[PDB]
Amino acid sequence: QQFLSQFYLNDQDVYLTSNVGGPIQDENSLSAGQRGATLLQDFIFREKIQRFDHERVPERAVHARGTGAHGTFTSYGDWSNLTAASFLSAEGKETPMFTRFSTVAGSRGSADTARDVHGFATRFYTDEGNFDIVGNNIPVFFIQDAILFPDLIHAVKPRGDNQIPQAATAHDSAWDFFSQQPSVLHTLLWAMAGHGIPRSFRHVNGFGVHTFRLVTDDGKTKLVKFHWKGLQGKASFVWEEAQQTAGKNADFMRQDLFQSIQAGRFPEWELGVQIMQEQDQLKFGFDLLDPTKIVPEELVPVTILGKMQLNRNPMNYFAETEQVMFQPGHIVRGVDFTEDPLLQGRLFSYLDTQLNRHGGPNFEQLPINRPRAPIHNNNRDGAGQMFIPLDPNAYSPNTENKGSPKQANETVGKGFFTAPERTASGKLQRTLSTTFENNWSQPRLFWNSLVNAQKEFIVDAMRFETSNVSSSVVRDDVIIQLNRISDNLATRVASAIGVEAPKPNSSFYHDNTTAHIGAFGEKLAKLDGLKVGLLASVNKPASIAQGAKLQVALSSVGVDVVVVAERMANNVDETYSASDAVQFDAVVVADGAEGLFGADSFTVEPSAGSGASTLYPAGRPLNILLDAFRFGKTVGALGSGSDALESGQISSERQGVYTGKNAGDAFAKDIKSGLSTFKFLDRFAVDE
Amino acid sequence: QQFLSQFYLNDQDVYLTSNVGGPIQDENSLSAGQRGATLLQDFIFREKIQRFDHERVPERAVHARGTGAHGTFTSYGDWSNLTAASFLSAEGKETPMFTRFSTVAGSRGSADTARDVHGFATRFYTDEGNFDIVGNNIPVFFIQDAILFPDLIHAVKPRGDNQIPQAATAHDSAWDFFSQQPSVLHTLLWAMAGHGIPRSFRHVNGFGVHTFRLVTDDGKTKLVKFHWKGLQGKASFVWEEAQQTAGKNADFMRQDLFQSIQAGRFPEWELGVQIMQEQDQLKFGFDLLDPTKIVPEELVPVTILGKMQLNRNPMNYFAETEQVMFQPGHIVRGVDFTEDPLLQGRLFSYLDTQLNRHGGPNFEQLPINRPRAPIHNNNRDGAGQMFIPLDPNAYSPNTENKGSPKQANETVGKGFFTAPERTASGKLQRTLSTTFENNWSQPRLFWNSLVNAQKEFIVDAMRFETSNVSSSVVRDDVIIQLNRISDNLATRVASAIGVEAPKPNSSFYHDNTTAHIGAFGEKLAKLDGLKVGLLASVNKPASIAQGAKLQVALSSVGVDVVVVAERMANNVDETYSASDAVQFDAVVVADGAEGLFGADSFTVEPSAGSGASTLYPAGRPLNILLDAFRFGKTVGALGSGSDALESGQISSERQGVYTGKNAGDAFAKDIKSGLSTFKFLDRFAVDE
Amino acid sequence: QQFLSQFYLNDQDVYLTSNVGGPIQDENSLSAGQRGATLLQDFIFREKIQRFDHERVPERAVHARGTGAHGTFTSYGDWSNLTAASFLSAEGKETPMFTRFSTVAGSRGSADTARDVHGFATRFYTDEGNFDIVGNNIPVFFIQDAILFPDLIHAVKPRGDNQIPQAATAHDSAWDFFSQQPSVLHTLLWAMAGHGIPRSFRHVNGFGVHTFRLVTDDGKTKLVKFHWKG
Numbered sequence A, B: 001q002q003f004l005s006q007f008y009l010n011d012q013d014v015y016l017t018s019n020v021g022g023p024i025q026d027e028n029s030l031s032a033g034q035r036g037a038t039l040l041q042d043f044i045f046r047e048k049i050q051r052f053d054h055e056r057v058p059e060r061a062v063h064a065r066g067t068g069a070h071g072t073f074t075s076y077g078d079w080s081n082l083t084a085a086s087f088l089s090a091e092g093k094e095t096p097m098f099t100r101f102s103t104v105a106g107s108r109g110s111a112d113t114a115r116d117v118h119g120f121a122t123r124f125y126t127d128e129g130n131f132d133i134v135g136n137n138i139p140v141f142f143i144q145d146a147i148l149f150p151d152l153i154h155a156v157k158p159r160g161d162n163q164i165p166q167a168a169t170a171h172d173s174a175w176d177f178f179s180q181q182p183s184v185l186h187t188l189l190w191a192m193a194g195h196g197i198p199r200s201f202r203h204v205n206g207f208g209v210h211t212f213r214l215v216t217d218d219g220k221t222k223l224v225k226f227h228w229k230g231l232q233g234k235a236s237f238v239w240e241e242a243q244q245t246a247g248k249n250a251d252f253m254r255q256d257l258f259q260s261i262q263a264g265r266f267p268e269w270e271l272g273v274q275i276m277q278e279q280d281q282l283k284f285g286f287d288l289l290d291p292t293k294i295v296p297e298e299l300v301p302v303t304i305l306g307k308m309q310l311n312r313n314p315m316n317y318f319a320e321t322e323q324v325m326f327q328p329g330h331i332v333r334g335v336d337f338t339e340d341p342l343l344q345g346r347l348f349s350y351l352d353t354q355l356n357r358h359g360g361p362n363f364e365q366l367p368i369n370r371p372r373a374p375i376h377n378n379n380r381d382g383a384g385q386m387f388i389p390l391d392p393n394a395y396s397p398n399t400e401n402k403g404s405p406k407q408a409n410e411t412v413g414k415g416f417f418t419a420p421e422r423t424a425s426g427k428l429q430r431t432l433s434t435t436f437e438n439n440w441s442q443p444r445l446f447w448n449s450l451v452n453a454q455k456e457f458i459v460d461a462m463r464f465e466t467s468n469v470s471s472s473v474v475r476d477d478v479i480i481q482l483n484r485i486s487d488n489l490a491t492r493v494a495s496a497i498g499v500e501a502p503k504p505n506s507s508f509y510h511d512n513t514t515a516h517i518g519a520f521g522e523k524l525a526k527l528d529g530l531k532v533g534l535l536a537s538v539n540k541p542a543s544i545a546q547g548a549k550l551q552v553a554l555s556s557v558g559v560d561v562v563v564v565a566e567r568m569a570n571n572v573d574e575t576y577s578a579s580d581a582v583q584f585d586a587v588v589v590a591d592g593a594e595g596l597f598g599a600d601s602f603t604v605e606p607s608a609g610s611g612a613s614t615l616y617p618a619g620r621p622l623n624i625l626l627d628a629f630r631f632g633k634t635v636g637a638l639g640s641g642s643d644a645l646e647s648g649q650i651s652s653e654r655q656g657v658y659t660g661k662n663a664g665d666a667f668a669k670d671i672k673s674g675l676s677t678f679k680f681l682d683r684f685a686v687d688e
Numbered sequence C: 001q002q003f004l005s006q007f008y009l010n011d012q013d014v015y016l017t018s019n020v021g022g023p024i025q026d027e028n029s030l031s032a033g034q035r036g037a038t039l040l041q042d043f044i045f046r047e048k049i050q051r052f053d054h055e056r057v058p059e060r061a062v063h064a065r066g067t068g069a070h071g072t073f074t075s076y077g078d079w080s081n082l083t084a085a086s087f088l089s090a091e092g093k094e095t096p097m098f099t100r101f102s103t104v105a106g107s108r109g110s111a112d113t114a115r116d117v118h119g120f121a122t123r124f125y126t127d128e129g130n131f132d133i134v135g136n137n138i139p140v141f142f143i144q145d146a147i148l149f150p151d152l153i154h155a156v157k158p159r160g161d162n163q164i165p166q167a168a169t170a171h172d173s174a175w176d177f178f179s180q181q182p183s184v185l186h187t188l189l190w191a192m193a194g195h196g197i198p199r200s201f202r203h204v205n206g207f208g209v210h211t212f213r214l215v216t217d218d219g220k221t222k223l224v225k226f227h228w229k230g
């Protein structure tokens, strides 16, 4: 906020002006008489409406729906023996960042909690150029060659004739593609697991996906995978809960990130690399160049390089978040590409697509895209040229500008250089590498590694999605492919969708596992920004007062208590009308609120002597409680509030149901335990 | 320069970087082996070539060919009793300016010296907003309603089928339009006179064309015409000279301006207004709203308000000159529009057309277009948004931003306001005003007011142009219209083009004149930047030495002496091969150079022993001399240099031919007298 | 469909081609060897990805979320005593139409069932030119002068800092504008009633909102409101 502040427009206590600084008024069109026609000479009208008429720019072709934040990177060491990259050159060295998180398929107003792969794009504004790692929350991708991207995306996006369905793979074309292109199976399993529906952007990890090269000044290389290890913990929804959130708060995840940062609860990730040798490319039984494969951490551990903290919200979403233009081609000395055909083609796309978004070639001149390092080159002109180059002789080699700008390379001026030992060999060809052909072993590895509940969630997701697939041909092709991963998986999905159970095809079956790969099964590391909804009543003021008492006990772990009541009164945060279970990570019925939770509240006729409230829909309080329970959330009750649990047929003997006499330390302890468990998986049926 | 310098990129003694600050080299593509194919991952190649591929923007729809300079305006007074305009509020108040001069019809890269109307666009960067007067070097325009602009311009521009001819009205469609739309006749006469082919942009006046309103803080108005009175004086070419210049130096006028500013010979114009009352709109015998009419200075004198000086060339032509986007809608408090239908429609076009040029709505954010005043409004977003608005509540009326930005109007915040007594009355209609119907009386006024030679130049121009009109219908229609101006004019043109001499139609004939309206007839006020070509010979070093001697005698009046010889040697500026009469305002043959001017030099056989030079084309020196004479320029000879005059059959008794013994003060005095006269009109035949 | 069919591209049982008619394959990038780098000379790759990279156009500034259908209008009469409009000149005269329905505030991909005013835009492809009535499902609008449109829309649309909330008036700026500009109250009541959340586009009426003029060949006029009665 040193650098960007030069572009700020402050509009506090000032007179309105045109875009060229003439003071104006803008509330009435210029007319010929009181009731007359509007005049063409009204330049105030036309300038104002013209800016409005042209406000929009094309949404991103993929990842249109996203949110961003500023942050800072701190290096944990001097990594110069591993890479020449300046931002990693010293312990404690700090580098500004901008990060954008996103879904993939949906357009820009689609719901945050759609099931999808998620983007995780991080820019380092380094002292030797902008460096972008444009990653995902899943370490593998659907396809093995960038040329297949429009096929994949056309298949997952809405139908060409009617543009249905929005932000969903639950339609024929998507599953047609997945089953025709089995490379997709690994990513598919991740997306059908908890990783497709995370609780927030703070509760995911990030991955560069591709193998990259790190390069030292003397040209030595290592092969790496980039990791962003989240310091909050993994937390994910179940499907029915994600759907409900989409209806109640389309902005759920962007709101969570914004509010956490405003509250000073800065989320953090550690940057790590799996460090490998050039000679390791084929050593592990798969190709390091294949973006559908993970390197299990049992084989190569993650070496931690430093830490990113997100600590500042944008001032203007459009200027900063909408306009940020990431490119994997934003590379710096000390990093190089590999021959991963997915990565290779990506490099073309990100330079080209900004011409669509920006409408011209000078997109790197936007404040959010500018480097924090000097720019000196012979590039010229183009629409939207915001600089005035003083050198009128824009060519090399020259004598007219005394040989400047000067060439920079491996040995002089700290130039970028391609890793010097990289070689090409063989015939020019359009082929699929024979090393890429195992599409099934790693999906089985992932499947083996999940807790039973998460295996079920995958099954339930695929049952849901493929029941929406009309084509019998597609449904059958899907089951055949799933069967090559696991006969159990295929059989459990087939039974819901009218497909005969397949016989085992054991070519790729195995029992290998890798640890903690699922979204479920580990406790949260931090509870920052989680919310407890305290269901209270204005008719019993002592119920409302329990909010403040519970809050004081939970403040130190960064948990907010939200007081819900029938109407806005002192110390009430929101009304039952405006509330839903999906807003809260835990729900607590306050002592004295139990009268709102009658078991007949859903269907009772609102007669005068029923004394039903008009302040919220029939059964709203009980609905919040029951939804919270069914979704697997921590539920609690204080004092007589436990009567509400009985009305809802919720036994206090169940895990994740807590009762307390009052809102003391003993109760807060239970709630903290519940919140760290996050979801109580014993409430979900599993196939026998 | 304090403002624009923040956008400067200095590339002296620096390493080459990408657009995002990464040091690079850019001289070899990345290849697979020494003789291999280029790799897609070469981001250095692609960023460099993408910038190049997108360098161009659409040329302006009209006035594509032009040049600009920075300057400063000084007010001669406190004009607050005449106008609320801030830049005219104090004696000695200074305001930065940018000015662009242009032709109209030709594309980018067309010749400076095409016959055309010329643009004269001046921006004042005032403390209360940018104010543009977008004018021409002729006070009247061809048409009376903006809606006819595409018709006029399609007719004047090249044919639709083959795009011939460039930058010329000498084709059927132009003269078809002129003869079908007699409103065009007044501007046509100005353009066919010397005003169509000026010597330089320093030697023209400027005009706002339209009647505007000036308005005081209390709402009182005057009607005005804006004038830019040039302080150098009017100077113009003859047609055959303008053509030869187009062949030898397409950049003649832009070069003249650039070099004059570099030499510190800053051209100046005084801003003036003819001040009239609202009640004067019809009382002069024509309508002040009619842009085809002048107000003769005999009826209303010009009141001088201040002075513009142009004193700094751009640093980068594209960034500054190509991207400057003028608008008559860039108006400030203290000025208002009139109901001139040409002005009225212009207001729409200049806001719309910048969307084409810039490719998006944020063109006022380009450095050259930004105001030197604060911007505060609720306009938002759009492609190429270079600001970050801090106010997230971009609407009025608001409480969320405490009611800011606040409305500015006549009485508060110094807002723009429409002159409060302007009224509308009558039926909505698409009609030509009955007050606009006299198309011929003022053309006759202009014709009457010219010296005989300039009458002849109009005749000669029309003879040239209409001899290139194939259609007999068009030729006949032209003569009919000209005849309504003057039977003399019509008959003189008709005789060249095979049209029968028309009978007089005396409806609009009159004998009134207005003073000094032509481009010819007055002496120059300043000789700054005029050029004397001294034709010398390396074989007679004393001839070259006369250059320095003549230069010393002429340096005090800002005239340059250019020494021309066979080859570059000490104190030689140009070679005969690279020289032409059109480069010089006067040509002098040096003592000792006379041997180069033999009468047989055009046709002698260049055989071995003939002695003829290969250093320049046959007859070049004599050609320069004879061209200079025929074009009407000052011609001189020193010492035995006078033998060259004898060879060219040029008698020294002729006006504007001067001889002397040596380059002393007496000869220099004669040259200054010749340069002040500029063109010797007695060398041109006139109809009897 | 006779008119639009000339622009149809039929891709049943055909070989794949480039945009300039050259038969191609598009499933593997051209590489230097089996595991090598992708070549710049792969024009098949670049044309395919360039088309993809540039698929999107800006969404409409308002009414971004909408759907359309083709149809046909039939005149019930010869209305020449009321209007010179050609498409209303004979009983039984038929004119092709296209209609788009929409919400107002939400972006592309926002929910159909957001509470909002709804667009009802109908084009008549008449024999004397295209005629559009660009209407809404509510007969009155929030503001009385077009110059206030960006103010209304900036207030209703998501906050400038964080772009929250999507497709909703349930935030401070919207209600700030509504309460500062009481002209908005009539439309507000319609939108807060069932008209803000219809069951479908088939179960709403349409309105031109503005008073228009109808004019006969001899220049006689009536003032009208246009209605589409479902």
Ligand code: HDD
Pocket (backbone or CB within 6 Å): A060, A061, A062, A063, A066, A100, A101, A102, A118, A119, A120, A121, A134, A135, A136, A141, A145, A146, A147, A149, A208, A209, A210, A291, A324, A325, A326, A342, A345, A346, A349, A350, A351, A353, A354, C049, C053
């Ligand atoms: C050849 C096409 C192609 C392919 C194969 C990929 N992408 Fe990409 N992606 C684009 C073409 C593209 C794009 C069309 O160029 C986008 C849309 C907007 C933009 O700036 O780039 C983009 C955007 C985009 C964004 C959003 C950046 C932002 O927030 O603005 C992310 C996070 C990713 N991609 C991530 C990935 C990952 C992790 C990939 C595989 C490992 C991947 N993409 C493959």
Ligand code: HDD
Pocket (backbone or CB within 6 Å): B060, B061, B062, B063, B066, B100, B101, B102, B118, B119, B120, B121, B134, B135, B136, B141, B145, B146, B147, B149, B208, B209, B210, B291, B324, B325, B326, B342, B345, B346, B349, B350, B351, B353, B354
């Ligand atoms: C309605 C169409 C129209 C009409 C009737 C006029 N103009 Fe204009 N003119 C334009 C439409 C336009 C334009 C298409 O909007 C241009 C082209 C580029 C631009 O910025 O504006 C322009 C450019 C343009 C320029 C170039 C500004 C520059 O250097 O960038 C000048 C000097 C003028 N015009 C002068 C005039 C004069 C003195 C007019 C009559 C008194 C006139 N124009 C009538």
Ligand code: HDD
Pocket (backbone or CB within 6 Å): A049, A053, C060, C061, C062, C063, C066, C100, C101, C102, C118, C119, C120, C121, C134, C135, C136, C141, C145, C146, C147, C149, C208, C209, C210
């Ligand atoms: C001056 C600004 C302005 C104002 C005051 C209005 N509109 Fe409008 N409207 C636009 C500016 C606009 C626009 C920005 O020009 C749009 C966006 C996309 C487009 O084609 O036009 C548009 C789109 C648009 C659409 C979508 C057409 C489609 O489906 O593509 C409809 C149905 C309406 N408007 C309806 C109305 C109604 C019934 C209005 C009041 C009676 C109204 N608008 C006032």
Ligand SMILES: *[C@@H]1O[C@H](CO)[C@@H](O)[C@H](O)[C@H]1NC(C)=O
Pocket (backbone or CB within 6 Å): A078, A079, A080, A081
């Ligand atoms: C890098 O390795 C070298 C040689 O082994 C040694 O000087 C040093 O321990 C290392 N330096 C850093 C940056 O840790």
Ligand SMILES: *[C@@H]1O[C@H](CO)[C@@H](O)[C@H](O)[C@H]1NC(C)=O
Pocket (backbone or CB within 6 Å): A409, A410, A411, A412
């Ligand atoms: C880098 O540039 C320098 C200076 O021109 C040159 O000497 C050197 O050989 C270049 N190449 C490499 C690979 O270092």
Ligand SMILES: *[C@@H]1O[C@H](CO)[C@@H](O)[C@H](O)[C@H]1NC(C)=O
Pocket (backbone or CB within 6 Å): B078, B079, B080, B081
């Ligand atoms: C303006 O007019 C008044 C009254 O006629 C006069 O006294 C005053 O000097 C004028 N102001 C200027 C700046 O000329």
Ligand SMILES: *[C@@H]1O[C@H](CO)[C@@H](O)[C@H](O)[C@H]1NC(C)=O
Pocket (backbone or CB within 6 Å): B407, B409, B410, B411, B412
């Ligand atoms: C200008 O605005 C002020 C303050 O809002 C208002 O009182 C006044 O009527 C306006 N003045 C004119 C001349 O319209």
Ligand SMILES: *[C@@H]1O[C@H](CO)[C@@H](O)[C@H](O)[C@H]1NC(C)=O
Pocket (backbone or CB within 6 Å): B285, B509, B510, B511, B512
């Ligand atoms: C000159 O103009 C005046 C005023 O319009 C007019 O009365 C007079 O007749 C004209 N005289 C000549 C010489 O035609």
Ligand SMILES: *[C@@H]1O[C@H](CO)[C@@H](O)[C@H](O)[C@H]1NC(C)=O
Pocket (backbone or CB within 6 Å): C078, C079, C080, C081
């Ligand atoms: C129009 O009006 C006339 C006279 O009132 C009437 O006779 C005629 O039938 C009308 N035309 C139609 C088509 O209704």
Ligand SMILES: [Ca+2]
Pocket (backbone or CB within 6 Å): A145, A341, A430, A431, A432, A433, C028, C029, C031, C034
């Ligand atoms: Ca391949």
Ligand SMILES: [Ca+2]
Pocket (backbone or CB within 6 Å): A652, A653, A654, A655, A656, A657, A658
């Ligand atoms: Ca329990």
Ligand SMILES: [Ca+2]
Pocket (backbone or CB within 6 Å): B145, B341, B430, B431, B432, B433
């Ligand atoms: Ca008119």
Ligand SMILES: [Ca+2]
Pocket (backbone or CB within 6 Å): B627
């Ligand atoms: Ca010649």
Ligand SMILES: [Ca+2]
Pocket (backbone or CB within 6 Å): B652, B653, B654, B655, B656, B657, B658
């Ligand atoms: Ca003489």
